[PDB]
């Protein structure tokens, strides 16, 4: 049994998730910078709307490290609907077999947290 290591991102508009270049990989203290690369995969639930007609809810997006999860066979950057690639500077373009996916029986999801940059590069950058 398999799951994203992280909780989902809720998309609030109509547009797909977008991330600044070099951002989008969830924070994870005990992670190597070689590993900071993967994809978000969209999931959409449907329920009845206020008019009784089936409708889509806000899509949720789940992160998977590169080479793991439902699209473990996709190479980084491959175009596919419902898939958003993200990578941090210095990440290695290699499958993250050792990280794999989360077994929900043994671990709860890690709260997905993104980095917070400055509006423009400043300070040392």
């Amino acid at each position: 049994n398999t799951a994203s290591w992280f909780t989902a991102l809720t998309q609030h508009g109509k547009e797909d998730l977008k991330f600044p270049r070099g951002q989008g990989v969830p924070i994870n203290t005990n992670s190597s910078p070689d590993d900071q690369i993967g994809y978000y995969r969209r999931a959409t639930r449907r329920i009845r709307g206020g008019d009784g007609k089936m409708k889509d809810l806000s899509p949720r997006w789940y992160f998977y490290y590169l080479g793991t999860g439902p699209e473990a066979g996709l190479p980084y950057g491959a175009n596919k609907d419902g898939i958003i690639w993200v990578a941090t500077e210095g990440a290695l373009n290699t499958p993250k077999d050792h990280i794999g996916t989360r077994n929900p029986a043994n671990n709860a999801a890690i709260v997905l947290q993104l980095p917070q940059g400055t509006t423009l590069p400043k300070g040392f950058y």
Partner: antibody, heavy 121, light 112 residues
């Protein structure tokens, strides 16, 4: 004391152009990132534009991109906003704001008094 | 997708205390925010930066009766010993690479 004084607001016909200015004093202007922020009557604050210390980098809210530019004259301690293709929904008070000098964050630590921009016939 | 949610209004009695709430959208529960006060017919004034661990840093000249705190995706501004001058719209501000975001603002009214 840090001071930011906005000028140049007034009436502008729709589709026309208008430049705002902000005169800064009381600190080293060229050491700080500077922002424009606006507020339509009775609504909230909305970020407009940002310019780096030396004017080499910039960014814009999606609602003004391709119509407004931001610029900076460090010798004269002045920040500008060139507005073009103005629409009625650009009406409001425009504020100059100073980004903190903190290296790791971008909150505003000082605000101007604002200048009113009226897009109307 | 980076969105700050504030309730439109709040009220409390003179001399009492009030807690205003800003909520970060999903994935940003670790972000710091800033609180700004806009008194009637005035421009805004920076109050405070609030971090996700609950710590906060007042601006210069801001009284001790203003404090900040945090829990999960929520950031709080607490004002005690409420005075008439404390009636204002309060805005939370946050930031990220290429972006600057404001909440809708909370109008505070001081009764009695």
């Amino acid at each position: 004391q840090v001071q930011l004084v906005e000028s140049g607001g007034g009436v502008v016909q729709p589709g026309r152009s208008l430049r705002l200015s902000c005169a800064a004093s009381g600190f080293t202007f060229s050491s700080y990132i500077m922002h424009w922020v606006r507020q339509a009557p009775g609504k909230g604050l909305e970020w407009v534009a940002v310019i780096s210390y030396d004017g080499s980098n910039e960014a814009y809210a999606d609602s003004v991109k391709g119509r407004f530019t931001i610029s900076r004259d460090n010798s004269k301690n002045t920040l500008y906003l060139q507005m073009s293709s103005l629409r009625a929904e650009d009406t409001g008070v425009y504020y100059c704001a100073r980004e903190t000098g903190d290296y790791s964050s971008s909150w505003y630590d000082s605000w101007g008094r604002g200048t009113l921009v009226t897009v109307s016939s | 997708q980076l969105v700050l949610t504030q309730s439109p209004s709040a009220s409390a009695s003179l001399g009492a205390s009030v807690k205003l709430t800003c909520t970060l959208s999903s994935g940003h529960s670790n972000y710091a925010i800033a609180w700004h006060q806009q008194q009637p017919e005035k421009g805004p004034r920076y109050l405070m930066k609030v971090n996700s661990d609950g710590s906060h840093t007042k601006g210069d000249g801001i009284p001790d009766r203003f404090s900040g705190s945090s829990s999960g995706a929520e950031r709080y501004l607490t004002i005690s010993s409420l005075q008439s001058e404390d009636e204002a719209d309060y805005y939370c501000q946050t930031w990220g690479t290429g972006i600057q975001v404001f909440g809708g603002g909370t109008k505070l009214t001081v009764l009695g």
